[PDB]
PDB file of C-alpha atoms and ligand atoms in Angstrom:
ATOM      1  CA  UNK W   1      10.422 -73.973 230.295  1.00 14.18           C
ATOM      2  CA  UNK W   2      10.016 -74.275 234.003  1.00 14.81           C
ATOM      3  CA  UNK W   3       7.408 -70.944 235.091  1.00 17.63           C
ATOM      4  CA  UNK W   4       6.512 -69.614 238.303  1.00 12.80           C
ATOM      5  CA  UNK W   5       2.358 -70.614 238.934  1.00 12.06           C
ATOM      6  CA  UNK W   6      -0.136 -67.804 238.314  1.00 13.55           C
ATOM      7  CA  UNK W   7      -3.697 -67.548 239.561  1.00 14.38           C
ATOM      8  CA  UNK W   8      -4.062 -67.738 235.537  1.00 13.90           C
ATOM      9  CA  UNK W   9      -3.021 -70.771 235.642  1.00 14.80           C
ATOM     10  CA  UNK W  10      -5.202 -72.288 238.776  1.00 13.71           C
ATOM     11  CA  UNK W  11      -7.227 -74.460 236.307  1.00 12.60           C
ATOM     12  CA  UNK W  12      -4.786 -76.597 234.587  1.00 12.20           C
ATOM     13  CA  UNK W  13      -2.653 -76.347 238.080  1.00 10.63           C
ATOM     14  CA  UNK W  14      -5.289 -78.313 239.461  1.00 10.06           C
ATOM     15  CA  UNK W  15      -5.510 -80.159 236.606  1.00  8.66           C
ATOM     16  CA  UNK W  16      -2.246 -81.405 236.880  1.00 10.28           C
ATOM     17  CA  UNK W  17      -1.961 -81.794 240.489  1.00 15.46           C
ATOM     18  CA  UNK W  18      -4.942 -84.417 240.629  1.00 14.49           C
ATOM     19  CA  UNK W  19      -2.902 -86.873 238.893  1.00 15.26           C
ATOM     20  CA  UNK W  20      -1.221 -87.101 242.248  1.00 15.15           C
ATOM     21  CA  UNK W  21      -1.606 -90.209 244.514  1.00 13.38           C
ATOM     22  CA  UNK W  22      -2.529 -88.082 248.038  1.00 12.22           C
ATOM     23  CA  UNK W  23      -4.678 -85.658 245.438  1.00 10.47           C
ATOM     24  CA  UNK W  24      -8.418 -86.941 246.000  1.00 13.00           C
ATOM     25  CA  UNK W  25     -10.836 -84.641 245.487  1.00 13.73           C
ATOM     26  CA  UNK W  26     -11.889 -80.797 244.406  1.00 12.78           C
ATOM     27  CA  UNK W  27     -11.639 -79.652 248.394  1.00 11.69           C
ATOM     28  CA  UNK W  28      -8.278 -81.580 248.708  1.00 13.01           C
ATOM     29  CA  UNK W  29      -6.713 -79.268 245.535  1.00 11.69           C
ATOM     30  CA  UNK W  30      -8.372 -76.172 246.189  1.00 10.63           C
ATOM     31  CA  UNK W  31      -6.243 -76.571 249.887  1.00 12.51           C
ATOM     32  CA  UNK W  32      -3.168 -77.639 247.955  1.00 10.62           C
ATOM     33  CA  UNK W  33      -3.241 -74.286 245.799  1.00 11.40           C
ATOM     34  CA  UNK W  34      -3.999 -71.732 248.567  1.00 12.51           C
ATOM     35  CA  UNK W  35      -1.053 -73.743 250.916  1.00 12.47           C
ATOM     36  CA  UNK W  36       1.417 -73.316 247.192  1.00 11.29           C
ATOM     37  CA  UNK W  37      -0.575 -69.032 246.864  1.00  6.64           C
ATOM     38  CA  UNK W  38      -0.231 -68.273 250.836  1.00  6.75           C
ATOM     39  CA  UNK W  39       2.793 -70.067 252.783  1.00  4.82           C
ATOM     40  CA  UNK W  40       6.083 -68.146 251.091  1.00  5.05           C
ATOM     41  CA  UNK W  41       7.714 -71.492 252.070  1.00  7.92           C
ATOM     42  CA  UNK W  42       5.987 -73.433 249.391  1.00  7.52           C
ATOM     43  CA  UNK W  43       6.633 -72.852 245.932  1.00  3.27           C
ATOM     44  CA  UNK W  44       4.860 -74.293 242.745  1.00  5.44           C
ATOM     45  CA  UNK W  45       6.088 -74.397 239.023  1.00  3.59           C
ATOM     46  CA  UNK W  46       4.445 -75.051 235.755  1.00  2.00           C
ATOM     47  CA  UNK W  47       6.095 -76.600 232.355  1.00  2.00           C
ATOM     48  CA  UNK W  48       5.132 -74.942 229.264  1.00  2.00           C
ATOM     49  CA  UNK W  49       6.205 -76.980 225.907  1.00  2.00           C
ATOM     50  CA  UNK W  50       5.339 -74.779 223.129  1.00  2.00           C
ATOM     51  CA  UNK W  51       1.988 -72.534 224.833  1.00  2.00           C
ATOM     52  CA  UNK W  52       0.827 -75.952 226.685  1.00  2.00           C
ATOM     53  CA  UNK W  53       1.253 -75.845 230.223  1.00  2.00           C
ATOM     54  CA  UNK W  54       1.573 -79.853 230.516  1.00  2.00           C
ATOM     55  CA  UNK W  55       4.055 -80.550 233.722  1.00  2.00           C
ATOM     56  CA  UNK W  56       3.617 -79.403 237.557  1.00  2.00           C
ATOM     57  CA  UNK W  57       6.259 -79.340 240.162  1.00  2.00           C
ATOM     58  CA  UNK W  58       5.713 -78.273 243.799  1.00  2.00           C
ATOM     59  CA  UNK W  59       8.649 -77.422 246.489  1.00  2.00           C
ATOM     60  CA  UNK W  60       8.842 -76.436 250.006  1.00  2.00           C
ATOM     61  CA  UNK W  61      12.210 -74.721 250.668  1.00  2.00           C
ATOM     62  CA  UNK W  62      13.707 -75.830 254.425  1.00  2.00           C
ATOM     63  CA  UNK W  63      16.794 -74.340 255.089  1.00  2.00           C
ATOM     64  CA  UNK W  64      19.660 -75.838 253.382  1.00  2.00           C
ATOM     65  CA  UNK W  65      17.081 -78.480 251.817  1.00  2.00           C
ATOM     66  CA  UNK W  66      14.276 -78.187 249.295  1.00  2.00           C
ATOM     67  CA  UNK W  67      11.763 -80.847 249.327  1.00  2.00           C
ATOM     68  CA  UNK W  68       9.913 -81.975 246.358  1.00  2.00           C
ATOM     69  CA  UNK W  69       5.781 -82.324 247.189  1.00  2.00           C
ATOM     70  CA  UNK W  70       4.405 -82.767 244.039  1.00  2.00           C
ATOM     71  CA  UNK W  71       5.075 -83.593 240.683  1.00  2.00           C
ATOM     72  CA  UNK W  72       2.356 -84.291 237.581  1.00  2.00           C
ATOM     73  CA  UNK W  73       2.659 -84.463 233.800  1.00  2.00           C
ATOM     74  CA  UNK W  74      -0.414 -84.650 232.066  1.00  2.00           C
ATOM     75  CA  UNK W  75      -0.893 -88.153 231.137  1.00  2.00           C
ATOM     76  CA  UNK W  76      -0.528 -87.235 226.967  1.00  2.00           C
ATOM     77  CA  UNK W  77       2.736 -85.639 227.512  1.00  2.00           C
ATOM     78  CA  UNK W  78       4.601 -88.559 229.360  1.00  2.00           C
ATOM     79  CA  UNK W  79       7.215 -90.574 228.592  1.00  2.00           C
ATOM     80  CA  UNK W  80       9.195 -87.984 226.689  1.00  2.00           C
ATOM     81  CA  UNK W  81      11.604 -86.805 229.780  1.00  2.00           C
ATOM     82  CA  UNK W  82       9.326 -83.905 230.767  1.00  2.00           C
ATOM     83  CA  UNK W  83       9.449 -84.992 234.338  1.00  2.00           C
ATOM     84  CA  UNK W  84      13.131 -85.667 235.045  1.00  2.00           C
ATOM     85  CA  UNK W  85      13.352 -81.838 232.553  1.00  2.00           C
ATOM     86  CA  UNK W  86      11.107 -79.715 235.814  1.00  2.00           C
ATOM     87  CA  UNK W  87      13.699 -81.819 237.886  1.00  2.00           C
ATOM     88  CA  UNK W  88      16.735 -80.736 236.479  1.00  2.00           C
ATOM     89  CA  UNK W  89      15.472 -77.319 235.911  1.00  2.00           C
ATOM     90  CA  UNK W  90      14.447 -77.215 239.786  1.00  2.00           C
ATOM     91  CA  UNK W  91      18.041 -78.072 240.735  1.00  2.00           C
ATOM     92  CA  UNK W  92      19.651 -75.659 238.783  1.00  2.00           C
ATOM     93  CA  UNK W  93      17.133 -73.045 240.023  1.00  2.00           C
ATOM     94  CA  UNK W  94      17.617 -74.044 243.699  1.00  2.00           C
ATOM     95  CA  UNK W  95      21.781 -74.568 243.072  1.00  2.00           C
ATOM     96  CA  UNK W  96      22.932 -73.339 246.378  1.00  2.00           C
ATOM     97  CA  UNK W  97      20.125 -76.005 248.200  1.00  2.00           C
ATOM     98  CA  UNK W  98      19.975 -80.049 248.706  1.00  2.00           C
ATOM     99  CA  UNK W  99      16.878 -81.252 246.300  1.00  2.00           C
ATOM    100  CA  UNK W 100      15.387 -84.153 248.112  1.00  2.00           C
ATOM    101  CA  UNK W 101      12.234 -85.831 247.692  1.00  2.00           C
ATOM    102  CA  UNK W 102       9.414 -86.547 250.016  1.00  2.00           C
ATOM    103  CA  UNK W 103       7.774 -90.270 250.683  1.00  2.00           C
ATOM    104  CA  UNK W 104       5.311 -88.987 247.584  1.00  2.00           C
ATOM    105  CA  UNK W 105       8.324 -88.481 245.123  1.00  2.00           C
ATOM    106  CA  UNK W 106      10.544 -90.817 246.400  1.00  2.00           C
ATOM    107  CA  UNK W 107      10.002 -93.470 243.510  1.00  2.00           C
ATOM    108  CA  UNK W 108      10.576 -91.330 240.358  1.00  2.00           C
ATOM    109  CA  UNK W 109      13.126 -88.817 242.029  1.00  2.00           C
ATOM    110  CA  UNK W 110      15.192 -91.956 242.849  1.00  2.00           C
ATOM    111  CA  UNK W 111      14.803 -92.744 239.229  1.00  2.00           C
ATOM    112  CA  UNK W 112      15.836 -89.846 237.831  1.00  2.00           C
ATOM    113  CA  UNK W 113      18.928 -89.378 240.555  1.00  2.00           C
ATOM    114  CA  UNK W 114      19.956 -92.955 239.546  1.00  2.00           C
ATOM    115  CA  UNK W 115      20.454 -92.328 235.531  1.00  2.00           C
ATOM    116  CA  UNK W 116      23.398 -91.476 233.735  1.00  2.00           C
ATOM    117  CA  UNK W 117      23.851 -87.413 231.812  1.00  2.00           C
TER     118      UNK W 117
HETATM  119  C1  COA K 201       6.047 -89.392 237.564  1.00  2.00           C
HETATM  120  C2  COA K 201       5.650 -88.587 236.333  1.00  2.00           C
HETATM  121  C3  COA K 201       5.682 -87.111 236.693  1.00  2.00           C
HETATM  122  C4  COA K 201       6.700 -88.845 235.249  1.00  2.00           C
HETATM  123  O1  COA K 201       6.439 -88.034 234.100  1.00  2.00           O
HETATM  124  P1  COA K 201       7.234 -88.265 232.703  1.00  2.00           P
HETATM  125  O2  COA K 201       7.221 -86.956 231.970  1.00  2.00           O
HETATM  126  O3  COA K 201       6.627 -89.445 231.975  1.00  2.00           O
HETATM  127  O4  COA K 201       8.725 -88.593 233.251  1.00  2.00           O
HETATM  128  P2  COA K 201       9.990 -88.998 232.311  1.00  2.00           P
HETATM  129  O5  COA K 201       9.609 -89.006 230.867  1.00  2.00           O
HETATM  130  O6  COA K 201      11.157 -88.160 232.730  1.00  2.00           O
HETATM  131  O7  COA K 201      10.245 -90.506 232.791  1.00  2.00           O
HETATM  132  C5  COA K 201       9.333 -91.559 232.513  1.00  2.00           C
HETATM  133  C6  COA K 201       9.819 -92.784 233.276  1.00  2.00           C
HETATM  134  O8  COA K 201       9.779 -92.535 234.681  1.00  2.00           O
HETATM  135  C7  COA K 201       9.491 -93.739 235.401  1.00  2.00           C
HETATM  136  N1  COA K 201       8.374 -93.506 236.347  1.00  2.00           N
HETATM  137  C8  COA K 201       7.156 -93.035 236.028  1.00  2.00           C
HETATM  138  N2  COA K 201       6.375 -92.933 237.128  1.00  2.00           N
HETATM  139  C9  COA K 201       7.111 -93.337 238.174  1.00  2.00           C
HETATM  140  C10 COA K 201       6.902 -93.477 239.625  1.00  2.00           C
HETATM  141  N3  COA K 201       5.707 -93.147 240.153  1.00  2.00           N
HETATM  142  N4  COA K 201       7.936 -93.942 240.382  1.00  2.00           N
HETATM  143  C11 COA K 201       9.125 -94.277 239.838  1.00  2.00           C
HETATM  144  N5  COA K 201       9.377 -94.167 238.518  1.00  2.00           N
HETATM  145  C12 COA K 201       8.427 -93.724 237.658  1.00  2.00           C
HETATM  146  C13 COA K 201       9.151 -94.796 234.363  1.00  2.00           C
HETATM  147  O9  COA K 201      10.255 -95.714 234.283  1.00  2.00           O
HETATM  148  C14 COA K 201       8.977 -94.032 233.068  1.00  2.00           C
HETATM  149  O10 COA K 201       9.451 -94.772 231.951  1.00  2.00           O
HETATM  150  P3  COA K 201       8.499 -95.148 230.703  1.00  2.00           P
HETATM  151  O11 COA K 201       8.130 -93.794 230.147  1.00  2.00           O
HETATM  152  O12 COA K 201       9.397 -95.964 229.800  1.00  2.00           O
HETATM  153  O13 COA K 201       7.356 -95.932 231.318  1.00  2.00           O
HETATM  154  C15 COA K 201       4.288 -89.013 235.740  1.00  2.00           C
HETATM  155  O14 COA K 201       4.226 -90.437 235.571  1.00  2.00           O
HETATM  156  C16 COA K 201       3.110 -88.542 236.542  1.00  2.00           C
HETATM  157  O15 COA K 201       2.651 -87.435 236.291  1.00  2.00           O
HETATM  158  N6  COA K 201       2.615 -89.365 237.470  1.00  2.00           N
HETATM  159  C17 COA K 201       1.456 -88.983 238.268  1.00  2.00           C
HETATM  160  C18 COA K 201       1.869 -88.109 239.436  1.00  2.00           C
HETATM  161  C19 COA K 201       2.784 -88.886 240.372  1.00  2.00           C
HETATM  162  O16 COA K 201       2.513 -90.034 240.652  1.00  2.00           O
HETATM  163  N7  COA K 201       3.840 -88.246 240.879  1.00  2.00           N
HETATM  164  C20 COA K 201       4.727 -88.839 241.875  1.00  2.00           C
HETATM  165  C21 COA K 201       5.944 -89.502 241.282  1.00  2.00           C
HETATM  166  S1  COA K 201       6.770 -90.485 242.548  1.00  2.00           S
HETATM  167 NA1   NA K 202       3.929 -69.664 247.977  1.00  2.00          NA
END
């Protein structure tokens, strides 16, 4: 189930952002969140299988576009279509907008676009 982020949730948010290539460092994250809390523009999302929060997925919403900024799965819960799931849920959340990737999620929102339903 795709969720809206909570301060709750800041911890494993973090968490899950890290895993992401322009994702450094502590300062880097703590920026990332308070740009996804502050700017009404930029929306993040959590995945919860079961109670585990285990996926992240972060938008910016530009006009008739919304760009994909991050997306994370924690490394356990790969491989088992949680990824292209937040995707899919994101585009049937944001139906009346374009989903498009930026250079960051390029690669695996290519993927996903290219497979068969
Ligand atoms: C990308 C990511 C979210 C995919 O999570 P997932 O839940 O395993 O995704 P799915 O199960 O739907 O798909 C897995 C497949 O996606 C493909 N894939 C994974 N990472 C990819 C990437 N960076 N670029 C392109 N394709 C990728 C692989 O073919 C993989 O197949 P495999 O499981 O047989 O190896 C995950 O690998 C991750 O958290 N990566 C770190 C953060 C990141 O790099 N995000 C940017 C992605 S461009
Ligand atoms: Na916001």
């Amino acid at each position: 189930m795709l969720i809206r982020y909570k301060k709750s949730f800041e911890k494993i948010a973090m968490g899950l952002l890290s895993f992401m290539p322009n994702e450094k460092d502590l300062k880097q994250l703590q920026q990332t969140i308070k740009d996804y809390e502050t700017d009404t523009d930029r929306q993040l999302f959590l995945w919860k299988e079961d109670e585990d929060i285990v996926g992240a997925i972060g938008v910016e919403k530009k006009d008739s576009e919304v760009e994909i900024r991050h997306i994370s799965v924690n490394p356990s819960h790969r491989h088992q279509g949680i990824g292209k799931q937040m995707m899919d849920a994101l585009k049937h959340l944001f139906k009346t907008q374009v989903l498009v990737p930026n250079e960051l999620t390029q690669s695996f929102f290519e993927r996903c676009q290219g497979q068969q339903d």
